[PDB]
Amino acid sequence: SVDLIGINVAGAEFTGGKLPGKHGTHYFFPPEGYFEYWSEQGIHTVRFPLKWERLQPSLNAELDDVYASLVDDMLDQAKENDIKVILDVHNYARYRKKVIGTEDVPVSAYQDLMERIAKRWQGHDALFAYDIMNQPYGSADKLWPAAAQAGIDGVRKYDKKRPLLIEGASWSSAARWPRYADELLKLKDPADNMVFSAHVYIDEDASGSYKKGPGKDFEPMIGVKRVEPFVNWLKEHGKKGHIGEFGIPNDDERWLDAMDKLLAYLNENCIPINYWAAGPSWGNYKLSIEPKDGEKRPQVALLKKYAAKDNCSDFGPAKA
């Protein structure tokens, strides 16, 4: 099923400079009982960041036993709690800081990673989709379309059915999406099951850092206005879409109003969202919606309201 409302569950990609790092010290997978809470809240789709260097510390090599087994366990817990999982290679189109498509990181090495991910997990019922790369940006933008094709070809060697979530250049910006997405139109999927996934934050610079408050002339429609270029591109080209990241602070009604207006527009166009972020080890991080004693999470009420209004059977927007 295609749920319009989902959440990022972040933690396995934390402390990216510590490689391999130690589970429970530098990075964190869901503990036992984690998925039960979100399932009870009516949230059944999760986007799950993974760090490429931890899954595959040598290019072209077998996946790391320890880290890949933690993914096995998390997928098992998801299935036990009726959670659908989008695996996210959360790597900015880079491996050990080098862009996919340079001599350091050939596209064939990225294809190898995606083959191994699909080979290991295509048989797992909790796996819903592959978000093949988080936020290409900067020096990776030009080479990203060719890298995306290699990642698509990699998954399709072993999984010929599941959707592939294809992000865009410039941090997968929804607001700037049509400026760069021309070369994504040339991507070819033999299974014809690609879904484009953009990101949107509503601080001034759209980084999602929220260094300041809303500001005097804050526009409540800012979220809608920043996803319109993306949704209109989908309609113009007959494509399907998705929003892989959006989040807001908990400390101003203006943020919540903009979130409500955004969710209404996504609902009208059958565009799913993955809120950023839940996760087992966020502490007092400003964008965390994980429960924490004494910290309010008004964003969750909005996600629940729109989960009850989900009447879509597929990724939109519908061609009508």
What is the Cα Rg of the chain in Å?
18
* Structure resolution, Å: 1.5
| 144, burial (CB in 10 Å: exposed 0-12, middle 13-18, buried 19+) | buried
Q: Where are the domains of the chain?
A: 1-320
| 313, burial (CB in 10 Å: exposed 0-12, middle 13-18, buried 19+) | exposed
Breaks (C-N over 2.5 A) in the chain follow: none
Distance CA 318, CA 87 (A): 25
Q: Report the C-alpha dihedral over residues 72, 75, 80, 82, rounded to 10 degrees.
A: -170
Q: How far is CA 315 from CA 3, 7, 232, 267, in A?
A: 9, 16, 14, 11
Which token pair is 84?
A: 């659908």
Residue whose entry in the numeric block shows the structure tokens 């070369």: 183
If DSSP states are collapsed to H, E and C, what string results for the chain? CCCCEEEEECCCCCCCCCCCCCECCCECCCCCCHHHHHHHCCCCEEEEEECHHHHCCCCCCCCCHHHHHHHHHHHHHHHHCCCEEEEEECCCCEECCEEECECCCCHHHHHHHHHHHHHHHCCCCCEEEEECCCCCCHHHCCCHHHHHHHHHHHHHCCCCCCCEEECCHHHHECCCHHHHHHHHHHCCCCCCCEEEEEECCCCCCCCCCCCCCCCCCCCCCHHHHHHHHHHHHHHHHCCCEEEEEECCCCCCHHHHHHHHHHHHHHHHCCCCEEEEEECCCCCCCCCCCCCCCCCCCHHHHHHHHHHCCCCCCCCCCCCC
Distance CA 203, CA 215 (A): 10
Query: In b/e form, how buried is each residue of 194-204, taking b as 16+ CB within 10 angstroms?
Result: bbbbbbbbbbe
> Smallest Cα–Cα separation from 86: which of 50, 58, 111?
50
Cβ-contact 33, 81 below 8 angstroms: no
Distance CA 128, CA 273 (A): 14
Query: In b/e form, how buried is each residue of 268-279, taking b as 16+ CB within 10 angstroms?
Result: ebbbbbbbbbbb
User: 115: Cβ–Cβ under 8 A, 6 or more apart, which residues?
Assistant: 154, 155, 157, 158
Cβ-contact 161, 152 below 8 angstroms: no
Angle, alpha carbons 269-270-275 (nearest 5°): 110
For the beta carbon of residue 146, count every other beta carbon within 10 angstroms: 15
For the beta carbon of residue 98, count every other beta carbon within 10 angstroms: 14
In the chain, the amino acid numbered 13 is: E
Distance CA 53, CA 92 (A): 12
Q: How far apart are the first and last CA of the chain?
A: 21
Distance CA 68, CA 236 (A): 40
| Backbone dihedral region for residue 208 (phi beyond 0: left; psi -120 to 50: alpha; all else: beta) | left
Cβ-contact 95, 53 below 8 angstroms: yes
> Smallest Cα–Cα separation from 64: which of 123, 125, 23, 122?
23
Which token pair is 156?
A: 């399709």
Cβ-contact 161, 191 below 8 angstroms: yes
Residue whose entry in the numeric block shows the structure tokens 């993955």: 274
Angle, alpha carbons 38-90-205 (nearest 5°): 90
Cβ-contact 180, 168 below 8 angstroms: yes
Q: Is the peptide bond before 280 cis (omega within 30 degrees of 0)?
A: no
Distance CA 202, CA 222 (A): 7
Which token pair is 100?
A: 């996919």
Q: How far is CA 203 from the centre of its chain?
A: 19
Distance CA 164, CA 249 (A): 30
Which token pair is 240?
A: 């399907």
Cβ-contact 206, 175 below 8 angstroms: yes
Cβ-contact 278, 288 below 8 angstroms: yes
CA dihedral sign, ordered 280, 247, 13, 48: positive
Cβ-contact 86, 47 below 8 angstroms: yes
Residue whose entry in the numeric block shows the structure tokens 């061609």: 319
> Smallest Cα–Cα separation from 218: which of 243, 242, 248?
248
Q: How far is CA 242 from the centre of its chain?
A: 9
